[PDB]
Amino acid sequence: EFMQKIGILGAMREEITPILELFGVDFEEIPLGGNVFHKGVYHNKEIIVAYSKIGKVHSTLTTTSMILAFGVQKVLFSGVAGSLVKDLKINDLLVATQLVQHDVDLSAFDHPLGFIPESAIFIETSGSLNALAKKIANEQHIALKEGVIASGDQFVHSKERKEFLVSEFKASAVEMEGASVAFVCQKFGVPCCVLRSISDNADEKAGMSFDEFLEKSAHTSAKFLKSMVDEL
Amino acid sequence: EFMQKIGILGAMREEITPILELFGVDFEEIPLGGNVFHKGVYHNKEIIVAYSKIGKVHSTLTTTSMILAFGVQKVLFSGVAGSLVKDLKINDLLVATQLVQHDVDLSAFDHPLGFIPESAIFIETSGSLNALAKKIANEQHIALKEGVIASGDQFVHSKERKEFLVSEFKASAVEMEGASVAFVCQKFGVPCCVLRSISDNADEKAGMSFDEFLEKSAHTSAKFLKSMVDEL
Ligand SMILES: CCCCSC[C@H]1CN(Cc2c[nH]c3c(N)ncnc23)C[C@@H]1O
Ligand SMILES: CCCCSC[C@H]1CN(Cc2c[nH]c3c(N)ncnc23)C[C@@H]1O
Ligand SMILES: [Cl-]
Ligand SMILES: [Cl-]
């Protein structure tokens, strides 16, 4: 009747397929703004699941729709990412403590890379949700890292860009949607958690690795997300 | 009572200051999602004016809010841009026939630059609004070009990037918001017009030129936008 409403996002269909299957409930499909929102009831929560499509514009739009049109009270993102640090290996999980838009460049006006006037380089996520993930991971004896995630509108697959992301932002992983999702949530005062499982190492072999591990890594993230929702 | 609702967007405050002044009516300030929406009544139309803040995430969010929360029926963007072609000089106006996100790169998977799965490289704008602009420009004896506008999250100020935009996309101008605004409008079936006045030539001197001409070029675009609204 007055159930908590939880938005759950992936970027690609492959990132939400395992989520829908794992919850195992019926969903109503609601189209809006070129996205399909799957609305169901799971453990006395209304869960709204969608894939945004790839990149920052897609993810910004879908997040905004989820908040303004569906009234979600928290947003959890689940999907895959490229690893930027040697201690994050294929299949490993992390939650973003902060996000950055790594491809923003207003250096022509002496702004630091990632910075836009009237905004900030780094976007924060929900301490409470991140602490819940840490609690669950320890109880399940699963490793879970915390760190900075870099988002941009390029698939990163070069040693040079990888090193830039580490040197400039101290990022632990790279993807194409988290910062936009967290940014929108922040603007609307909605708690946000960005969870990723490593699919590749963001180098010259990344396309290969991503193709090999998308399905498995997406499933690993999906399983963990469900375990979080179970305690919300 | 049942007036047409028109959304009007700039990216920076400087792009909307002349718009608000030129309409010359009282506006109610309504904050939402970190933007301020100026709502007024002008010639029996409800006009909703806002600056998005710079770049693709900001502009996507503001456009989505304008449509979902304010119910606007058309969106007109007005502001400044860098020229990519010698026949577009400082202060000259153009309307975007199509827009592209010039910084999107999924070439690791052999996708063409600008392309994202389940989307398209080029986003269309409103033929009807573009034709209105052309009609007015001819009646006012003002030059008005039509062409492709490239949008990305970098201020472009190098000969190399400028040449890339021309060779890859046949773009006539560069900015940081038009494609995201047009993209959102398209997804919601809302007619969109992107109008820009040249502030710089998108080369190594662009920062200088932009600083010099922002105010004047913004005013030129604002004046033209008002002339369009007068005939809506
Ligand atoms: C199907 C063809 C296009 C695939 S583009 C990659 C997907 C997976 N997402 C995360 C992602 C994993 N590895 C990455 C990397 N190396 N760089 C940047 N993002 C990532 C972002 C985007 O939604
Ligand atoms: C105040 C410091 C930051 C200014 S960033 C430039 C503004 C003006 N907009 C259009 C614009 C004109 N010239 C351009 C160029 N050469 N490259 C890309 N965009 C442009 C985009 C953005 O909203
Ligand atoms: Cl069910
Ligand atoms: Cl008035």
Residue identifier of the C-alpha nearest atom 12 of ligand 1: A81
Q: Is A153 on the interface with B (CB under 8 A)?
A: yes
For residues B55 and B194, the answer to whether their CB atoms sit within 8 Å is no
- Residue B227: what are its φ and ψ, rounded to 5°? -60, -30
Tokens standing for residue A79: 């999907």
Contact B195, B149 (CB under 8 A): no
Given a contact cutoff of 8 angstroms between Cβ atoms, the answer to whether B144 and B134 are in contact is: yes
Write down the H helix ranges in chain B.
Answer: 13-23, 56-70, 127-139, 159-169, 178-187, 206-229
Helix or strand holding residue B105 (H, E): none
Strand, coil or helix: B91: coil
Catalytic residue among B46, B92, B175, B200: B200
SS3 at position B203? coil
* Cα dihedral sign, A40-A67-A36-B68: positive
CA distance B143 to B141: 7
What torsion do the CA atoms of A49, A51, A57, A60 make, to the nearest 10 degrees?
10
Q: Which ligand is nearest to the CA of A197?
A: 1
A221: which 2 tokens? 């993230």
Helix/strand/coil for B168: helix
Task: Identify from A12, A13, A52, A61 which residue to disrupt to test chain B contact, counting B C-beta atoms within 10 A and taking the largest count.
Answer: A61
Contacts within 8 Å (CB) and 24+ apart, A117-123: A117/B12, A117/B53, A117/B54, A118/B53, A118/B54, A119/B53, A119/B58, A121/A169, A122/A98, A122/A148, A123/A98, A123/A99, A123/A179, A123/A182, A123/A183, A123/A186
With CA atoms as reference, report the closest residue to A12 among A150, A232, A208, A199.
A199
Domain A1-232 has CATH 3.40.50.1580: yes
Separation of alpha carbons A223 and A18, rounded Å? 8
> What is the secondary structure of chain A as a DSSP string?
---EEEEEEESSHHHHHHHHHHH-S--EEEEETTEEEEEEEETTEEEEEEE--SSHHHHHHHHHHHHHHH--SEEEEEEEEEE-STT--TT-EEEEEEEEETT-B-GGGTPPTT--TTS-SEEE--HHHHHHHHHHHHHTT--EEEEEEEE-SB----HHHHHHHHHHH-EEEEESSHHHHHHHHHHTT--EEEEEEEEE-SSTTHHHHHHHHHHHHHHHHHHHHHHHHTT-
Asked if B57 and A53 come within 8 Å (Cβ–Cβ), the reply is no
Are residues A34 and A5 in contact, defined by beta-carbon separation less than 8 angstroms? no
| Start-to-end CA span in chain A (Å) | 17
Residue nearest to atom 6 of ligand 2 (CA): B155
Q: What is the resolution of this structure in A?
A: 1.9
| Residue-level length of chain A | 232
Q: What residues contact residue B211 under an 8 Å CB cut-off, 6+ apart?
A: none
Q: Give one word for B12, left, alpha or beta, with left for phi > 0 and alpha for psi -120 to 50.
A: beta
Tokens of A86: 């040697």
Amino acid occupying residue A38: H
Helix (H, G, I), strand (E, B) or coil at B174: strand
